[PDB]
Symmetry: none
Subunit: 250 residues, 2 copies
Amino acid sequence: YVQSLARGLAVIRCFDHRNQRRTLSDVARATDLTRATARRFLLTLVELGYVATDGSAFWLTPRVLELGYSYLSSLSLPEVAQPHLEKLSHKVHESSSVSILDGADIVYVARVPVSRIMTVGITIGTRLPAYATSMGRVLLAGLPDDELDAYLEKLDIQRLTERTITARDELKAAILAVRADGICVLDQELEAGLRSMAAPIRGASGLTVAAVNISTPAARYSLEDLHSDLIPSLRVTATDIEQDLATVNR
Amino acid sequence: YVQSLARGLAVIRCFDHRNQRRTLSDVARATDLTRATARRFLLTLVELGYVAAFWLTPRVLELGYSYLSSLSLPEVAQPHLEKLSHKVHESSSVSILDGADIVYVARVPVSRIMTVGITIGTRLPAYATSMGRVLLAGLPDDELDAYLEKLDIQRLTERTITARDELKAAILAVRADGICVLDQELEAGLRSMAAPIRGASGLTVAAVNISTPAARYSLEDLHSDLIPSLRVTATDIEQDLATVN
């Protein structure tokens, strides 16, 4: 663990909107350092061209943008989501995906499969009806009310399994429940023996822009086990993806 | 002088759009470090959240953002660019001058099949961009001449101006007109237009622009529809900048 690297970075990070220029003592204070240790880092950064000074105040220069900015700020939603899906899937040993809404269908945009014989994973670019998927109900809960009502007016609900919700009013209710719970569990309404759970991914304004799921055979978990073992991690993954997406698009 | 600081930053610096993933052997080669030294850096960055093969994480954006945020201009401009791009449905930006380059500090992208996208932190030669010519126009004549003395003009497209006196005359006319329209001198099929943003000094300190495919608008349409909006955006940003300083 190279302390000096950590400290030099903390010095760059101590500049912001409220703190545009800082004195040596103020940089020391902001980074939990002393004047003598802070000075060493500040003078190296000045030498490197990352910091400028007039003798009393220090501030950052545009060279700091050379550290990754022009390509990290261009990451797509799937590229932001991928490492987080990989961590989630590796933690719970189940398929995880991200999708977005396209009219009446969800479209898969990122996924991590598991290596099993019987697997429930769908390839990127596949579409599925929004009404019959956990991600779809999450995305639909994110619509403005007039758009949701329009969607539901236009929808031809098909009986896909013996458990598929069949009434427009019961469907609307399941979608509004998702709005209240922050998650959707879909129990074999798409295919018998298959379960999915999904959570919203929001833009920085709180608008739902994508959904993330875990999908699993009904035989691997009771409904109660999903809540104790999988849904907590799914929530954390959704929030991790949100936070990165916000940083990237800032 | 803290050498391990210098090296740790050289490690971050060696990752780019092409080279987003690198093994520990990849990274040591790249920075002329020992495998052993090249290794302790990676792992401090891993503990610190800046690295996760190895790759930069979005937390690396907090370094650049400390700059951007500690400058008044980028966040002051942002809500005006949002309105500008929403009105004209084209990508808009703000940049400042850094030696011979402009550097992008604020943006709003507009996406379609063929997209004009330049990201924050991108650096481009001032002589070949509409914002660079606006920024060079704002230099005192002696600084302009010194800039031109060091400049090696490249042929970026078949249309790029090739002669220094020609370039200097173009810059002086931008100074007179208060805008620059750069028609396909940086990339074939690409047009942009820029207006200056004046600082506390009454001097140009930054520039704002719109860029768009040449095939979307006639030059006439640019002058009639888009450029009047850009000019009011420039002055809205100058006014907001004055309140904050």
